[PDB]
């Protein structure tokens, strides 16, 4: 998956090599890399399948971004920075932690100024620490004037046309992601459509279609890690997660200037290449198109995912306590549906 | 369970003996037998627990009913009569049979005149056949005038006061049940409140509270045998139904003049005593009181049964096909809740 590494212009050699990639238990095949002018690319997006677009110019102004530029221009607002002693930055919803007092996150969020993030990064490097940092902060009007100008220069013409053709709802947020080499965001699915715009460095993206729900074992809806896979990709527990032996991914490596369409409900695992330096990415999250007036049968996989989420949500509310959802589901199926 | 057989008045001896009862795998304890004037009886009904009331006079006019009287007076309408070559008359909903083309009922319903039922009964006896008949027909205005007069003479004063004190909805139907000795209605639960009025012969009634759902394994909601237990009480399959080894029943034997309160959602297994002659029973089904305005937590067992039924109903409708309910539930729980 992801094919042979591409050759950089001006005979600069391959951007990356196979050694930089982590080793996993499942096979993959490549995500198509296409021009935004290619009819096959529009067909893939229309059919809610992933595609890497190589020439959108979506974040062209941001390609000059590095830590010095951003530090000097992004202003004095607060940035959410996760810290961990593991390469894995498993996302968790802090509001759901009261449901699950036994959950102890491996990563911690700290709010800091951008120059504080840069200094903490520099200090880790100089002392050779094992601590890892991932900055994950949605962009807003508080950024300095030059970042505002860079944002205004994104290819709104192209992406606004996509939003309109696909019948999507509003752009809800743009997440700025700055990670250290080797950082991993573990497999999960998002409930919005995503154009994932790579700015600096290289990220390996492994996607799984919504019909692999049965192989990826999301946490309960009420758990802080709702929408994230329970499977440890580095040591999969096949006794608890037997259908993870049947997973099949779609993979690619995106670099500066590439844009990956991550369709809504598609699982994705994202890793900053080993020994590849820091990585910078900005995503574009859009609400999905409304539920159709006439529902067509048989349902699509993502529609059954939506039903399952809603059953879990309804039961938590009706039982008055999320902890009772599991026992009630088990009572319903044992000796009656299994 | 059911204690020592009661002694009939006038030194007529015990009504029945232990040999007449079928042998089952679980223990039981007796249902209380009380006067309708006893405050403990009102307390049990108010708390939706079973009680046998010995002196209600609820169906006093009907105590003279036998096959000759009914044949001569019940008129010329049609009566539903089930036939089987087994003692077990497992109920099934004929409308749900299209969902489950693999279901082949062991009993068959035939519509016939009452004199035709009596003749068929007599013919079985004379030839010593093994065929069994169970007449199960809701009473209505079509019955002859003397049965109307007998119905009017039921103790409406007493039962109307019960309906009012308990906040029940309307009387929906009165089912006339006439069975052969040894007939069994297998364990099930009804969604209405029931005063079960015994007229002729003796019936052993074994009840299980709603919190034994986990031990009695009802069929799927969409299956013709919705609300009936899947467990064969005469040969329980503990590999499929392991918690049937934990069932505990409440039992009694009702005879002429007795009235058993079978609370809504309570499982009941009812058998006409072996070698006891034909049995006649008339029940009184009332809709339950409306759902409370303020739901109190933690929920009662019958409220969780109601939730489970509604989840199954909703999923069948949303998926467009009842056969998909099981696979979706299994997908929801495997490796996530079990």
């Amino acid at each position: 998956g992801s094919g042979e590494p591409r050759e950089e212009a001006g005979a600069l050699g391959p951007a990356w090599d196979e050694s930089q990639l982590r080793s996993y238990s499942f096979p993959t095949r490549p995500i198509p890399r296409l021009s935004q002018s290619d009819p096959r690319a529009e067909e893939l997006i229309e059919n809610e399948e992933p595609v890497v677009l190589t020439d959108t110019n979506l974040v062209y102004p941001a390609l000059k971004w590095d830590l010095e530029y951003l530090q000097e221009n992004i202003g004095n607002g607060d940035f959410s920075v996760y810290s961990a002693s593991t390469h894995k930055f498993l996302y968790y919803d802090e509001k759901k932690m009261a449901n699950f007092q036994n959950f102890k996150p491996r990563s911690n969020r700290e709010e800091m100024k951008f120059h504080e993030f840069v200094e903490k990064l520099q200090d880790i490097q100089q002392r050779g620490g094992e601590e890892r940092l991932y900055l994950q902060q949605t962009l807003n009007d508080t950024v300095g004037r030059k970042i505002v100008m860079d944002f205004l220069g994104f290819n709104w013409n192209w992406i606004n046309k996509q939003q309109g053709k696909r019948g999507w709802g509003q752009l809800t947020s743009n997440l700025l992601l700055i990670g250290m080499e080797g950082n991993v965001t573990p497999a999960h699915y998002d409930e919005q459509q995503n154009f994932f715009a790579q700015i600096k460095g290289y990220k390996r993206c492994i996607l799984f279609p919504p019909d692999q729900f049965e192989c990826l074992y999301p946490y309960p809806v009420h758990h802080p890690c709702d929408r994230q896979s329970q499977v440890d990709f580095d040591n999969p527990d096949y006794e608890r997660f037997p259908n993870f032996q049947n997973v099949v991914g779609y993979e690619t490596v995106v670099g500066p200037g590439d844009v990956l369409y991550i369709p809504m409900y598609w699982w994705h695992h994202i890793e900053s290449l080993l020994n590849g330096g820091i990585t910078i990415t900005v995503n574009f999250w859009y609400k999905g198109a409304p539920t159709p007036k006439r529902i067509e049968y048989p349902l699509k996989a993502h529609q059954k995912v939506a039903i399952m989420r809603n059953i879990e949500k309804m039961l938590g509310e009706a039982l008055g306590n999320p902890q009772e959802v599991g026992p009630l589901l088990n009572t319903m199926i044992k000796g009656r549906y299994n | 369970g059911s204690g020592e057989p009661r002694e009939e008045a006038g030194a007529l001896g015990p009504a029945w003996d232990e040999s007449q009862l079928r042998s089952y795998s679980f223990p039981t304890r007796p249902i209380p037998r009380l006067s309708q004037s006893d405050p403990r009886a009102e307390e049990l009904i108010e708390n939706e627990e079973p009680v046998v009331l010995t002196d209600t006079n609820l169906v006093y006019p009907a105590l003279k009913w036998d096959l000759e009287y009914l044949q001569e007076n019940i008129g010329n309408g049609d009566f539903s009569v089930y036939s089987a070559s087994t003692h077990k008359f497992l109920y099934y909903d004929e409308k749900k049979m299209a969902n489950f083309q693999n279901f082949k009922p062991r009993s068959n319903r035939e519509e016939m005149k009452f004199h035709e039922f009596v003749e068929k009964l007599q013919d079985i006896q004379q030839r010593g056949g093994e065929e069994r008949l169970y007449l199960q027909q809701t009473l209505n205005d079509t019955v002859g005038r003397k049965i109307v007069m007998d119905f009017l003479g039921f103790n409406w004063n007493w039962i109307n006061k019960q309906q009012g004190k308990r906040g029940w909805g309307q009387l929906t139907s009165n089912l006339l049940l006439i069975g052969m000795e040894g007939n069994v209605t297998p364990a099930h639960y009804d969604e209405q409140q029931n005063f079960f009025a015994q007229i002729k012969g003796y019936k052993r009634c074994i009840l299980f509270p709603p919190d034994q759902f986990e031990c009695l394994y009802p069929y799927p909601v969409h299956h013709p045998c919705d609300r009936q237990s899947q467990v064969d009480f005469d040969n329980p399959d503990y590999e499929r139904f392991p918690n049937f080894q934990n069932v505990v029943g409440y039992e009694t034997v009702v005879g002429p003049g007795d009235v058993l309160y079978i609370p809504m959602y309570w499982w009941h297994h009812i058998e006409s005593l072996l070698n006891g002659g034909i049995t006649i029973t008339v029940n009184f089904w009332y809709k339950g009181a409306p759902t409370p305005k303020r739901i109190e937590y933690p929920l009662k067992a019958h409220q969780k049964v109601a939730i489970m039924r509604n989840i199954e109903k909703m999923l069948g409708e949303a998926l467009g096909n009842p056969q998909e309910v099981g696979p979706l539930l299994n997908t929801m729980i495997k490796g996530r809740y079990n």
Binding site: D93, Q136, Q170, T172, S173, N310 | -
Partner: peptide, 22 residues
């Protein structure tokens, strides 16, 4: 419609604070 109710999508994503840019 019960089908429409149950197929209704949410909008959750992996971000602690969400906001549009303007």
């Amino acid at each position: 419609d019960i089908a429409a109710l149950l197929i209704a999508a949410g909008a959750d994503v992996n971000a602690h604070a969400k906001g549009a840019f303007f």
